[model samples]
Target: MDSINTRIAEELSALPSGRVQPQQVAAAVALLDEGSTVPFIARYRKEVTGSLDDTQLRMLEERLRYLRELEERRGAILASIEEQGKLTPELARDIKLADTKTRLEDLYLPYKQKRRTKGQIALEAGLGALADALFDDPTLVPESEAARFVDAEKGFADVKAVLEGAKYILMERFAEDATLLDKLRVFMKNEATLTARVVPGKEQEGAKFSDYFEHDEPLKSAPSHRALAIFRGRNEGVLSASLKVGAPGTLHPCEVMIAERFGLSNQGRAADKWLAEVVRWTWKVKLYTHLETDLFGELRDGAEDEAISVFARNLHDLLLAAPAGPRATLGLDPGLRTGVKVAVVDATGKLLDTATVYPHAPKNQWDQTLAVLAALCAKHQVELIAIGNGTASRETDKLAGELIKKYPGMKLTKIMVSEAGASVYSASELAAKEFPELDVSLRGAVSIARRLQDPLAELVKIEPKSIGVGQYQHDVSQLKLARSLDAVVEDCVNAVGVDVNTASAALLARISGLNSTLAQNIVAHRDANGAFRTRDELKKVSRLGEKTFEQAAGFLRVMNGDNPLDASAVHPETYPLVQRIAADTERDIRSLIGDSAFLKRLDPKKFTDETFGLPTVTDILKELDKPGRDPRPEFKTAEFQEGVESLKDLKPGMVLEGVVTNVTNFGAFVDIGVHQDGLVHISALSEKFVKDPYEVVKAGDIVKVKVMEVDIPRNRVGLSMRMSDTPG
Candidate 1:
């Protein structure tokens, strides 16, 4: 009914998806504007949003932000043009109707202010009339036409100088034509070849990008991965890249289009050839260069979108990987030059002690290392051994193996955890606060121990981009990548829910409406008054208003709280409805919880009211069946073959189990127990035709693959997931 909502609804309804309803979009927009986070709106306010799921709500929010920004930009453009005394009804109407920022910019290009250009100088010197005469009548003779305009005092000393001045004027006119510019841009995007050539003297150092050195492909056909590789090569000064539409001498199709748009034809007329030359110069000197850079950015943005999504998906899988649960554990950050860093943590992940061990090379204290590790394990009653998968990981794992064998009665499960962001985490400000007395290197071992205990909680402490799950993450747009990855973390945290009493500030910050300050406040309150007794006590937290609680309470849980419902996914707002349900079922609220057999017998329709619809009632009933249930899978770990410790030991046709570390558009990288991960190309992802690597395997999936090829010098291993495929 309101103007802004009506406008947003209209814009969203026009999108390609058929599921969007104008009313529902407007309601969702209003809810989002009212400070509802995406996860909260998607999960709690489903009735208002017509049951729009997370994906739909996220899309709506993104489009709404862009459309609102477009409106603001449109107002500024109108004000700017009106201030310049150039605002016409037709132009104003066009600006209002423009849907995309690019289109609006195109319309404003001709009137945009700039420094004195050649065209402006030509006009100042009274050469505009001559230029207009030649363009208005292609039959006009260029030399004779320019002869009338040649004046020494006016800065045109000769017919040649006058013609050159007219050329500049004509080029500006052609470059600024909005319709023609748009048409030419579309044509170039579809017709141009994205070409890359090796830079002069960087061949030896840039051998990694050899495939792109002589690359040529249609711009429209370039996939994100290949385009990104070529762009990265160009960025690193290993290659020179450009977009080419046609060869020289022959009229470029762009030039032909420009000439045709201006009604210029070479029919052997007096100025026909000269006009064609102007068109060619328009493209070569101005339009082509401008559009080339524009299209390159377009390609780069598209590639970055794919790269961001890849990173987001990989992060989602990594964050949701099965947690090994709370257990007394010993973590080892493996190294040779610097001895293996060790930290022992209790079942609750509280650091008990830290030490260093050297079992390799120069200071090979194999016996001493075993003695120290065994004593720590025994003292802490460790149940798990977590080894960081980095340099000397295999060596450390062997030491762990020896420890397991020597102390068979100790009963410890050894696991290798991916330490992608361990070093970054070690040096972070947050890590420093957690371990002020412990060394920086030793803090990583503590992270390793906790990561095995609960990955979602520990990984949130590190910046998502540094986790290194995607290809060319460093080369893409950092802001966009960070937003996408942050969303993934937020979604995972909300989906899994958090333990309010024990969650770290990094973990709590991701829960719905709570930010870093609010998270720290909650932690501070907890530390001052012991663990949270019930979710209600969160109200006493500083700066946590009712609205913040409304958005965040459903995601935060208190285990064994005073009230039975405090630990469940059921929101406090629905507590009354829950009580009503419990009364109707003829059982107490505590008894009704998790009694799926009893809850299933009661019809949901009887519980629905005007305030709570079928969807809410159904979700409430479901939550009652499994209160505060973790959405992650059962804990599992892949067993890397014992003998396959390094790439040298890998042989073709050897079938080994591995955990997928990352999945991209092209292939999945599998950690096959070697120092370097092996590539299982998309073609070999499955025996069936796999269009996407994600469909077959995610980041944490354990899969069986046979080695097909090994390039020792390159440190590359090719693997095949197709069990029947023979080695090459």
Candidate 2:
């Protein structure tokens, strides 16, 4: 246990010292070990961790986990080698000093259990001493030295056979030398190139991967997207990828390193030629094959890590998208062969009505569809229309525009919402449980409307990957992807407090200390009894103990509760401090809340007692000024061109407005109300050089783009954000 702590401290101290202190990591780790979550620790325990934010806390948690597992693995490796009775003092020290899994495994390679090899067979044939003697003295004649080990009964019949056995033993010895293996591994990482070529018959089938058909990239510098693309092509059997080491001819650097390590060169000596041949055989037969596999695995792991990061960032932006707030909304699930599914939801997302309207081909009942929609809008007093961007979305959007013109006084707003995961959500078990009797198709309509009302709340119901703002998400490690996406959801959910009375169980499950069971219990308690009137009332819910409440209360808001502070982000434990402030000011707490001028004028030092310091006092003041304030941006929408409905309508030089759908390392995909999204390459994202696509745009940013090229057969449109750039 002490060793683990020491290891963690050493690792933390090595990080950028200016941003985070080792003691701060220790304090955060202590809080996490005691069952406090990242969000709770970051928001409420500022003094304990010296004001480490959630991002820093998350990074600290991940490192702490990895270091603890590393310690466990270290112990296991030590035990395995000690039991084998091959644990020398020097070997034990080297194993103990290894900081990475790769280094430790390399140190343990010679003693690891394996199948019987040619080298072991040679040792059993009494050639071990001959091999050692030849390595120690290069002046000895190889055939003369091996003649003494010619024992016919043990499979060494002649000088040639004895020399072969000695060679095999020496090859194994050089291959297992940990120091030489490490040196060769580093050389390959710096000098190797990942080369890829298309399979002959698969060129036409995998044209999407044409860029990598005859590609060569430095293994150390390949970006995540390109690496993942090449790997995906290989998995699809359309490409063959390999790590090409050294230039075509001349002495390769890896073989040279092996020769240097063993001190074997073609000097004029009796056994010099034989020793040099052994080094070449060692390089060809053992080390190259072993290290090549290891390096490629390392590269793939790194690429997956970067891809997971991109997925997490995109998920964060999509979840925190500006909510339209609580308003009556009508959701339309656009379709062509099947009718468009319709659902009406009230301000709180309660389903009020549902219908099916066939406004496009094969039925084309345009007039009847318009009449039905108008009646539903007037009956429910719907204020917003959310059209799913699917097959017949443009046609449905046109119908919505016609409805707006017909009833200008109704004042309804129509929005095209991304339907990436609506179908998945409709088929989910949670959706089935939420609407037991509603049709599966109508359940999707409900999700569409609710997402526009509050994306963070509605999106929690669907799996994170299914929401679809990821780069090669499916090809990466599923466990790592799920863990990262879950953390992003948790951060977003806690950033904007959940209303305990109206929030769904899915949203509540993302709270700092609440799990699926606890969230469901809270909902059941509310249904059985009544709405919680105070934050303290949460204690009555089954399985919600004091510890859970301590971690969760700050992120749960109770509007119109008995205590006015319950509606703010201030935790319940600090209510006395707030009451004391109200007593000192000679004003009631309710009157003091939202009074920014009065609160800002008070000295924070005066409120700083033993438990609450300047940071906590400052946060409390900000929360009191705008109780239950949302942290998301203001709601906004992009308007598409009137006549541009498909790829054919897009022409070069035409500037249009669009919403960014997905941001990748190389570019951003934009939706301009066309059936197909267009690509805005990284260079075209800005006039100035951009290092990252995320720096210039995110998933939901609205921007003006000029069409540069259009390929009708490929359904590709190249766009440029540099309005000054001429069209192709």
Candidate 3:
């Protein structure tokens, strides 16, 4: 018997290998089993896993879990067969070698316990031996031999009854035979068409799914979005869906196919008298139904996989948007009749003050609102104004522009940040805990403020689905969507390290090995014991063990700490290495933290050891050269045209600037300062052929678009990015 480690390596290698080798993945699996997180292993234990990043690490983890589950199922299946006294050597070898769940289940189908059926009843009545004798030679002894078992006690009426019961037994056996079923499944998948038709009275209710009504597409050729759409229509009681491998309404094609595979001539030969009946029964009644059901499940899984991929990519783009950095910002959640909810957050995102300015609609107090905003900016020395791109947003931007021009002393830039999920975040329980003293409406203003300052930090506070980064999010499997999106968040959070002293519990919970409870405890410790002056101080927090600290320490940054090296991504385990480099250079570790010129001149080879290989040592040297560096892109904002306030105020070929709100398989939606977002379909995204929308645009991107057309009744705006700046 091999060890579990050896088995994992063989299984992972036997299947398909990923970016890392099988042995490396096995090492990662062992580490994960020993309670190591992806970020920790990828960052801190670089040499052990051969520099596999978080994405590769996660892929390996998913595969490892799947392989482990497969083996567990295999073990159970073997035990079941052994207990039944039916475990043959060949069968055991086949089961052991099977790599897929489908194959494993197929091999176990014959021996699997099933409900009481005709076959089971016949076998119970002592007619199985007669049936087998007849099956081998069906000449003249069939009915006589069947009648020999016809004892009146067990309800065996006559020879006809006995033979009919035996045939039923043979029919089910032939239908579920492993090789025959596998052969038909492939045929059905290739030749079948998935069809959808509207229910008699559901035409109006399912109008949005019009394309799928009365639709037929080859099973293999159907796109994931379309398949999911048809399934939704079917599940919602508006449409009926099924798969068919035959013509119009007949199962003749499948009948012929099954008959041909069985070599049934239907020539009335004595030895093969019942083969034709069994073939028809298997194809039309038993196998066809089962095969279609299996196809539906496989198709749904494929659709879920594709939808999850689209959503994951969009979310990755949204969370990794450029950070506007620590600048004093004024956030204004725009409103029509109420007022523009105003909040000023300092450079570190602390709420300095709150106010309300009613500059639009019912209260046209423009002068007072302008004066109030000007005073707030002056008091806090605000560098930028972040106006929520919601109701009355363009009007608010016009007023903000007025203020920047009215006051020569202030150099302020106004940007329209997305308020997609800000209201939801404000009303969440987490928000209540963070801002207990503030009103619910005012908390929204603070959210808008922080989004412009750091998108990943502020956006992580809200659910990614609510951020509107992808299409058909609600249609896919919620569990899969959440897992993929959480992975995206984890990758983003670890990629852009968090601040130890300033990060919220919500942000800290997303770190490698920490949870929400532990994050809150860390916050509590910080409150009672002051700021985490060093990475080692985390141990003082309740319930934060060495393992947790080892996993999370590298990704949490501390500024102006006890040691300058603590602020960098370099792990505490490598502090001795840094000290050695500093000592070799004749300087203290503190002075060599960001001394790039001096640090680059030293030899990294001299510091490499058996534990810290070239990759680990090289990573450390790079970190020392630029300690605590943020990985976010440079901060920039799209400028919405001042006058375009709604979809109605648009003309064809009118060029404008906008921010991308969502990207999908079909197109990208842009927020062009209009209350309604405009769609630039994939064909209009570029002059050349665009196979994928993301190849041209993604969420949070600032792009130029020209209005192609607008439908006022439908409230739809068609945008085009194909035209050059001046409109071709």
Candidate 4:
């Protein structure tokens, strides 16, 4: 290991809180060794890890890999220098201590091979011998003495050219020292300021990026998001970018480190001054320019990743929205050419009936389709109906509503389901296996029904990015977007534990401590041994480890477990403490759990220890109220307009009710009483410059919208909030 690696490891080891454990670090290293992604290890290996979450694990893993790569490069450079017979003990130490790629390259700059330059041509003219003589001298001597080695045949026409070439090479080599460059980088990072401005002529006209048109801020103080936004605006030709560093302050540390290493003598002082001058000159000329480009690139990448992460998180949450549960339901995949493909599913998502109806095309099959849907509802006792907002959804809804009006006592409602990723899933390998008996086109109908039954369980099978719930999702980095979306899914899955007996392998694999293999094993174990009676039964599964049990047990519920808490989120570790509290209150754990008076009587200090702290205690008390109660909102169905069938039914200034399908940075898209939803841009959201649409509306919210315009040929609909209000 190089000195920097050793220093980092020592720093991590010395942390007092034990938050960064040695084993966790080792696990990160081992993961890197195996080429497993940081996100993969963090989510799927909870059993092997001590519940180390994705953020902490990813940070350690990324930093460690970078440091190791830097060390390897340092070794190569040192080897190359040694082969050239220019390696000294001090120089070797300096190279090994270099902490960055730029500094290392700087140290090797003079010795590195290059194309012909002024210095190279001068050396070829026999100026190298005279240069060497001057470098070896303790002090400046007479011109005659320096010119003694200069000869016309040797290509040195004059002593001036020879001395000048030698000085250039010497100064360049001195400035390239690894130690000096490393110190300079640290100084620049800590003391630099970034500035930007639009071209003078275009400041008010072509440059519309007003936020960064004329801005200056310290680099260290600038947030990653802001830095990236500024760079992007500049790159788009709206502005110019510049970086400035405090020359005197930035070079002082380098002078100190160099002087200390070489000792405090006349030569040491001279070397320090020369190094400081080189640093200042480079900062004003080469280094500052390079840093501006490099830092901007880093910032731009960071900003894009952040934006993607935000999008992924939103999409994940929308996908994990609470399902209407295991009730018989009708699914309608609305289309213009193919009509509406309708399917009825029983409580277990098993298809009971299916058919194609053209409610919008000439309105010929509306009566027949209504009769068939009514019969299916009666036969299956369907509680809800799901309609895909694709082509003719509003017409299908009108047909379904007419049937609902006929059955006054029937408990039936309509909900608009997002068809994001539906086509992708229909043609996916998993879908082929799941529905071998059905046509690929029919898969969309089945997906709509299943989504209403359980959104999270069905959606987890599709990639999160494919879920169309964000703005400009395709513009972001794929790896970053995938990792972020995966984390959101894991968080949601763990937050609401799965019913071990009922969850599919895809859903089970997303549980806190489970992997694909383990999830399959659990299913196999259930199939062979029967439904789990308690969370502890998971320990019997093959490859299930102790650590996994601890992290995942609380989130895995057994409906009829021996202990009531087993069906709740009360982790096994806190079971005894709950029992103690119950005994103290003269009641059983279940009765005393939500009893505010009993909880008030118990002292938190009683349970304070190395393992159970105030934070865990507070969480336990809250979980007791509704042990496995889901945090998701209660399921409800949306309502669409009557008599309104398609976009042709919509008129300018006509008010209609709708459901908020998605909220994004730019605006919210609402599914009005038509197939295509309309965008309520941020400017149109509440007549203000809305920073985020989410603050005003969210997924599944019902709102009223006004039809501002409609294009039948393009199948586009424009909506406005100027004349709309919330419906009672």
Clashes of each: 0, 0, 0, 0
How well is each residue in 323-425 modelled by candidate 3, as lDDT tens digits? 6789999999999788999999999999999998788889998899999999999999999899998889999989998998899689788887888678889
Task: Give the poorly placed runs of model 1, Cα more than 4 Å off.
Answer: 1-18, 78-97, 139-144, 147-161, 336-339, 356-379, 391-409, 636-728
What is the Å distance of residue 642 in model 3 from its true position? 13
RMSD of candidate 4 to the truth, in angstroms, is 12.8
Candidate 1 positional error at 319, Å: 1.5
| RMSD for each of the candidates | 8.5, 8.9, 9.3, 12.8
lDDT for model 1 comes to 0.86
lDDT of 4 by residue, 308-359 (tens): 6556545554554657888898988987667788888999898888887776
The deviation in Å at residue 496 for candidate 2 is 1.1
State, as a TM-score between 0 and 1, how close model 2 is to the true structure. Answer: 0.81
Q: TM-score of each candidate?
A: 0.83, 0.81, 0.77, 0.58
lDDT ranking from best to worst?
1, 2, 3, 4
- How far is 68's C-alpha from truth in model 3 (Å)? 1.1
lDDT of candidates 1 onward, in order: 0.86, 0.85, 0.80, 0.69
Per-residue C-alpha lDDT of model 2 across residues 1-728, encoded as one tens digit per residue: 55554555566555544345566677888899999999999899999888877766777778788878777888888899999998899888998889888888888788777657777888999899998998889899999999889999998899998888898898888998899999998888898998999999998999989999999989999877898998899999999888777634577778789988887787888988788778878988888888888887888889898888767776776686678888999999999778899999999889999998898999999889999989999999999999998889999999999999999887788988878679999999999999999999888889999989988888999987677666587788888888788889999899898999988898899999998999999999989988999999999999999999999999999999798898999999999998888889999999988898999898888888888888888889899899878766555442243433678766675666778999999999998777778889998898557899999999999987777888899988888887646673
19-66: candidate 1 lDDT, tens digit per residue: 456779888888988999989988888888788867667767776777
Q: What 10-residue stretch in candidate 2 is worst by lDDT?
A: 635-644
lDDT of 2 at 523: 96
**Where in model 2 is the C-alpha error above 4 Å?**
1-18, 78-97, 121-168, 247-250, 267-278, 334-342, 352-381, 389-410, 437-442, 636-728
